[PDB]
Amino acid sequence: GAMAPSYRVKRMDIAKNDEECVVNAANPRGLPGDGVCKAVYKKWPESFKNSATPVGTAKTVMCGTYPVIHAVGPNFSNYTESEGDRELAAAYREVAKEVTRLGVNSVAIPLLSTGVYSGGKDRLTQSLNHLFTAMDSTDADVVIYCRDKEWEKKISEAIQMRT
Numbered sequence: 026g027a028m029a030p031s032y033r034v035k036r037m038d039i040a041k042n043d044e045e046c047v048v049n050a051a052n053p054r055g056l057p058g059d060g061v062c063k064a065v066y067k068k069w070p071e072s073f074k075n076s077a078t079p080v081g082t083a084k085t086v087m088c089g090t091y092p093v094i095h096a097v098g099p100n101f102s103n104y105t106e107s108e109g110d111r112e113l114a115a116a117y118r119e120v121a122k123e124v125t126r127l128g129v130n131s132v133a134i135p136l137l138s139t140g141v142y143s144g145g146k147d148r149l150t151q152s153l154n155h156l157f158t159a160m161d162s163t164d165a166d167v168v169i170y171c172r173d174k175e176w177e178k179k180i181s182e183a184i185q186m187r188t
């Protein structure tokens with residue numbers, strides 16, 4: 026475990042992370058995709074061997090010894106708000122299980138279902154709160170990755186609010 030488990034936020038490419046493993050915002054079919062997923066495919070293409078997994082699940086595939094946790098959030102274009110919220114919570118619970126199983130001291134995570142799976146809504150708070158519910162019982166250092174300058178400020182404020 027980390028000596029003093031923390032949350033941090035960085036505004037940069039998750040493919041340049043400084044953590045012991047990465048969470049991919051994957052599609053259910055293990056396809057290269059777009060957004061975070063395309064960056065992950067360019068950096069760790071070997072990790073997409075048999076990476077297909079259902080919505081609300083996570084599947085880890087090694088790239089060398091570096092673990093890529095493929096986590097499949099719901100596309101809110103297809104799910105109801107209610108069923109989508111359940112699947113988004115479940116995907117992050119499966120990420121916490123994988124992070125624990127791997128024995129890593131740190132993990133790079135993106136906010137699931139906030140990009141092309143958001144159904145055109147702002148889901149920063151919804152996705153971040155489900156990340157916290159899952160990851161609070163783990164002792165890995167968590168580093169959240171984002172692209173937008175206003176999202177960086179809001180995520181940082183939410184981390185700081187809990188202290």
Ligand SMILES: CNc1cnc2ccccc2n1
Nearest residue numbers: 038039060061064170171172
């Ligand atoms: C287009 N490439 C990327 C790479 N890393 C990201 C991390 C968080 C959100 C979006 C991101 N996009």
Ligand SMILES: [Cl-]
Nearest residue numbers: 036037038041
């Ligand atoms: Cl960058």
Ligand SMILES: [Cl-]
Nearest residue numbers: 139140141142
């Ligand atoms: Cl997304």
Ligand SMILES: [Cl-]
Nearest residue numbers: 171172173176
């Ligand atoms: Cl963002």
